[PDB]
Design a binder for this molecule. Structure first.
Ligand SMILES: [Cl-]
Ligand SMILES: [Cl-]
Ligand code: NA
Lengths: 236, 233
C-alpha cells in the first residue's frame, strides 16, 4: 500500500539479485582441480564481464547484427582464451560459457522475492536471453511470474524499448511499474520513461575493489538495504 | 532429445466453463435479479471468434484476448438487455482471470517441471495469463503468449517463435493440448505432441476433441499419466 497503483516490480538480475562473480570464480576453481593445475579464475571472470561491451554497444548502435547474451558470452570467452593462451575444445567452451547459467543468490534474494510476490507481480528484466534466465531462475529458485529479457525486444538495456516493452507485455502504464536494481544507470533510464525506481546497493558485486554504484545517485523512490527491507518499506 | 513442454492453457489445464458459470452464480447471489449465466458463458467464446479471425486475417488490427473478451461481453450485454456498469463489465471481463485447474493439473505440473521447462503457449495475453497462473498456482518457467508474437494460434509464428525464445529446435519441444487443431499445427512445424482429452471442457453436450485425431507422440489421460509415460521413456 506504499503507492497503491504500483502492481509489478521488474528486477535487474545480474548483481542485483545474484552474485555472478563469486559463482564464476568458484566454477573456474572446480575446473582447475579437474584439469592440470592452476587457472587464472579472478582475472578471467573480471575481464569477461567487461570484454563484450564494445560488442554489446556494437549491437546497440547497429554496427553489428543481433546476438543474444549467451552468444556474446561465447565470443568474448574465445577472444581471451586466446589472449590468455589456454586452448579449449568445443566441449569446454560450451561448459565455461554456461557458467553464467548457475549463479548464487544474495542471502536476501529468495526470501525477499517470496515476500514481495504476495503483493506484486515479479518479472526479470535482464540483458540475459530468455533461455539463460530460465537456467538462472531454476538454479537459484527465483520465483518469477514472468521473464522479460532483451531477446523478447531485440534491444539491450538501457535502450528504452526494453522498459517500454516490459510494460506493454504486463499491460501496465509505466507509472504502475517499479524497477528494482543495483545499478544507477538502469534506474536512470527507467525513471525517464515514467517508471518508479528502487535501488539496492550490492557493494560486493565486483569484489573488494568495487568503486561503482556504492550509493544512490538520484532520489530513487525507494532506497533499500536488501529485498526484505524493500518489502518492509513497501508494505508500510 | 526433449527439453521443454509447451502447454495450451484454457481447456487443457483449467476448466474455464465451470469457473465462469460459478462466478456468474456468485454474482447473482449479490445483485438484484437473475442473469443468463450458463447461456452467457456458452455464447461468449463464439462471440469473439469473428473479432479474432479479423485480427488474424488483417481485416481488423491487433487486439489482445482481454480486450476481445471485453468487446464481446459488451455485445452480449446489448443482446440480452443487460444494463451493466463500467465497473461490472470490468469485473465480469475479469472472470477469465480466475480459472480452476483440473484435478490432475497442479501435481502433474509440479512433477513434470523437475525434468522439463514448462511454458504456457496461449492465445491469452501475457497479463491475463499471469493472473490465471497466480490464482491457480501454475508453476511456469515462462509464458509465451499471443501478444508477445503479434499472432494467434495456429499461426506458425506462435509455435516457431516459442521455440526460438527457448533457444531450442522444434524437435526438442513438445506441445501438450487437449485440442487436436493445436497439435496438428505444431506437428506440421516439427514439434513433438501430447494429447490429453478433456471431454467436459464444453459441458455435458461435448462432441469435439473427445479423442486423438492423429497418432500424437503421446496420448495421455491426464498430466500424471503423461509424467508416467515420459519417465517410462
Ligand atoms: Cl540481468
Ligand atoms: Cl490457452
Ligand atoms: Na453471438
Amino acid at each position: 500500500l506504499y503507492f497503491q497503483g504500483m502492481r509489478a516490480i521488474l528486477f535487474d538480475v545480474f548483481g542485483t539479485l545474484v552474485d555472478w562473480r563469486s559463482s564464476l570464480i568458484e566454477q573456474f576453481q572446480a575446473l582447475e582441480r579437474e584439469l592440470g593445475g592452476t587457472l587464472p579464475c579472478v582475472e578471467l571472470t573480471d575481464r569477461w564481464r567487461q570484454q563484450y561491451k564494445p560488442a554489446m554497444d556494437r549491437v546497440r548502435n547497429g554496427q553489428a547484427p543481433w546476438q543474444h547474451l549467451d552468444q556474446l558470452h561465447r565470443q568474448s570467452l574465445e577472444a581471451l582464451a586466446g589472449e590468455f593462451g589456454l586452448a579449449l575444445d568445443e566441449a569446454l567452451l560450451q561448459r565455461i560459457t554456461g557458467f553464467w547459467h548457475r549463479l548464487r543468490p544474495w542471502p536476501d534474494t529468495l526470501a525477499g522475492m517470496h515476500a514481495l510476490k504476495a503483493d506484486y507481480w515479479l518479472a526479470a528484466l535482464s540483458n540475459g536471453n530468455t533461455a539463460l534466465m530460465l537456467d538462472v531462475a531454476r538454479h537459484a529458485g527465483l520465483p518469477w511470474d514472468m521473464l522479460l529479457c532483451a531477446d523478447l525486444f531485440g534491444h539491450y538495456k538501457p535502450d528504452p524499448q526494453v522498459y517500454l516493452g516490459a510494460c506493454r507485455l504486463l499491460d501496465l502504464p509505466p507509472q504502475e511499474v517499479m524497477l528494482c536494481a543495483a545499478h544507477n544507470y538502469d534506474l536512470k533510464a527507467a525513471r525517464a520513461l515514467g517508471l518508479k525506481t528502487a535501488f539496492i546497493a550490492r557493494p560486493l558485486e565486483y569484489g573488494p575493489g568495487q568503486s561503482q554504484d556504492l550509493a544512490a545517485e538520484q532520489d530513487w523512490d525507494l532506497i533499500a538495504s536488501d529485498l526484505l527491507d524493500l518489502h518492509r518499506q513497501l508494505a508500510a
